[PDB]
Structure formats: structure tokens, C-alpha cells
Amino acid sequence: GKSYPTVSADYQKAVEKAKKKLRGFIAEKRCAPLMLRLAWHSAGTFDKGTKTGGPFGTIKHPAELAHSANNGLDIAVRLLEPLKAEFPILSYADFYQLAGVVAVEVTGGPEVPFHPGREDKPEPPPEGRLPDATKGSDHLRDVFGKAMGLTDQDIVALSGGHTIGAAHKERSGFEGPWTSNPLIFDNSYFTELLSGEKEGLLQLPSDKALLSDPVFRPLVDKYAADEDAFFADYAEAHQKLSELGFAD
Numbered sequence: 001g002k003s004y005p006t007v008s009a010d011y012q013k014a015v016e017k018a019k020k021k022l023r024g025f026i027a028e029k030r031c032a033p034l035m036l037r038l039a040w041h042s043a044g045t046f047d048k049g050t051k052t053g054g055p056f057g058t059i060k061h062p063a064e065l066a067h068s069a070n071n072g073l074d075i076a077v078r079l080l081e082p083l084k085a086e087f088p089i090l091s092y093a094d095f096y097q098l099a100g101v102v103a104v105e106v107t108g109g110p111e112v113p114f115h116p117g118r119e120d121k122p123e124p125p126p127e128g129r130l131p132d133a134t135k136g137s138d139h140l141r142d143v144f145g146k147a148m149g150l151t152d153q154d155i156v157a158l159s160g161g162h163t164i165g166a167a168h169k170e171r172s173g174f175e176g177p178w179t180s181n182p183l184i185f186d187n188s189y190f191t192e193l194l195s196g197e198k199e200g201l202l203q204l205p206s207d208k209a210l211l212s213d214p215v216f217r218p219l220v221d222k223y224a225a226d227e228d229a230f231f232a233d234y235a236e237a238h239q240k241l242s243e244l245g246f247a248d
């Protein structure tokens with residue numbers, strides 16, 4: 001149900017050039033996972049009932065970076081500031097979401113469709129909307145479903161974003177990568193979740209909750225068996241996530 005706004009030709013030209021520049025920058029800096037986390041934490045605050053929060057540029061605000069769920073993301077924001085400055089026409093909202101999309105692409109992931117025109121909004125959402133890694137399926141549904149308005153399928157596919165990167169004991173407290181290949185976007189997050197705890201790889205309780213829920217488990221299996229299917233459903237869910245509250 002989207003109606004995307006019209007942006008000028010200059011704005012579109014800027015999108016295209018920023019996209020390229022973000023590829024090169026994110027690849028060199030090895031920071032795709034962090035950039036994915038930044039985009040996801042920007043969008044993930046959306047509350048459908050109130051139409052508050054969501055991917056509207058507020059994560060750049062020190063007040064939103066201070067939320068405990070956002071530990072470390074001040075790094076991401078600082079990393080992007082000089083590039084963003086080359087693209088003054090673009091909203092921060094658009095820029096961060098583009099960086100999330102590129103993160104996925106340059107690590108070998110699907111091409112998530114991108115539509116410009118998000119406006120930067122002045123008020124960060126209240127803290128406490130992003131998910132708690134120590135909780136389970138009900139909580140996931142409360143956050144992704146009742147707040148954001150995404151689907152059960154979307155929940156499992158987006159969990160797959162842990163296919164890249166790692167936790168840090170100084171940020172969340174959790175530590176290490178979910179996968180043996182943490183800068184490669186693939187279905188390894190699901191294959192590892194399926195094979196049990198292997199030494200040196202991370203599983204959050206929230207990842208584990210996928211295995212015991214009657215709706216989530218068949219999806220984990222599908223994605224572990226079929227990376228093409230994971231990529232399709234991941235791209236659908238990321239696009240939706242990046243557009244929460246935008247163009248409705």
C-alpha cells in the first residue's frame with residue numbers, strides 16, 4: 001500500500017551517486033553490519049497506532065543515540081557524517097536507509113528496492129521500542145507485529161540480518177559473530193541456528209525463540225534449505241522495514 005513521493009531530478013541524481021559512494025566506503029571500512037544495524041534501529045522504532053518513530057533521521061540525535069539499545073551506533077553516525085556532507089540535498093532519513101540497503105548489497109545480499117523522499121523529523125521516539133535479546137516469540141510479535149506492523153514471516157527473515165556482523169560485550173554485553181563468515185550475506189544464520197551451539201558462534205535468546213515457535217520454525221527451515229527463498233523474503237521485509245510510516 002505505498003504511494004511514493006515525487007523528488008526532483010537533482011535529488012535522484014544524488015541518490016544514485018550516494019549509493020555508489022556508500023558501496024565503496026562501506027566495503028573499505030568493513031562496516032556493513034554496523035550500517036545495517038543503524039538503518040534497522042532507525043526504522044525499528046515505528047509504532048503503527050500512533051505513527052510515531054520510524055526511519056526519519058532521528059537516530060543522528062544524541063538523545064536517540066543514548067538509548068541503551070543503540071550503544072555503538074554513535075560510531076556509525078560519525079563514520080557517515082563526512083559522506084553525508086557531500087550530499088546535502090538528501091535527508092538523513094534517506095541516507096541512513098540507503099546505507100542499510102548498500103550494506104546488504106555489498107556483502108553479497110539481495111538488492112532491496114529503494115525509494116527516496118523520507119523527511120527528517122524533529123522528535124526522536126521514546127526509548128524502549130527496539131527488541132530485547134533476552135526475550136522470546138511473544139515479545140518479537142509485540143515489537144515487530146503490534147508496533148511496527150510487519151508479519152511473522154518478516155520477523156524471521158529480518159532476524160537473518162544477524163548473518164552479518166557480531167555482538168560486542170562493551171555494547172550490548174553479548175559477544176561474537178553468529179556466523180563463520182560475518183561479512184558475507186548468506187543463509188548461514190539459519191544453518192547455524194539449526195545445527196546447535198558451535199563454539200565461538202553467538203545465539204541470542206531471541207534467535208533461539210525462532211526455533212521453538214510453530215510459525216517461525218518452518219521459516220527457519222525453509223531459509224536454511226533455500227537461500228534464494230531467504231533472499232526474496234529478506235528483501236521484501238527489509239524494504240517494508242525501511243518504509244515504515246513512509247509513503248502510506
Ligand code: HEM
Pocket residue numbers: 032033034036037040072131132133134140158159160161162164165166167168169170171172173174204206
Ligand atoms: C529480532 C530481534 C533482534 C534482536 C533481539 C537483536 C539484538 C541484537 C544485539 C543484542 C546485537 C548486538 C549489538 C552489539 O553488542 O554490538 C545485534 C547486532 C546486530 N543486529 Fe540485531 N537484533 C534483532 C534484529 C535485527 C534485525 C531485524 C536486523 C536487520 C535486519 C539486525 C541486524 C543486526 C546486525 C547487522 C548486527 C551486528 C552489528 C555489528 O556487527 O556491529 N538485528 N542485534
Ligand SMILES: [K+]
Pocket residue numbers: 163164179180181182183184185186188189
Ligand atoms: K554470514
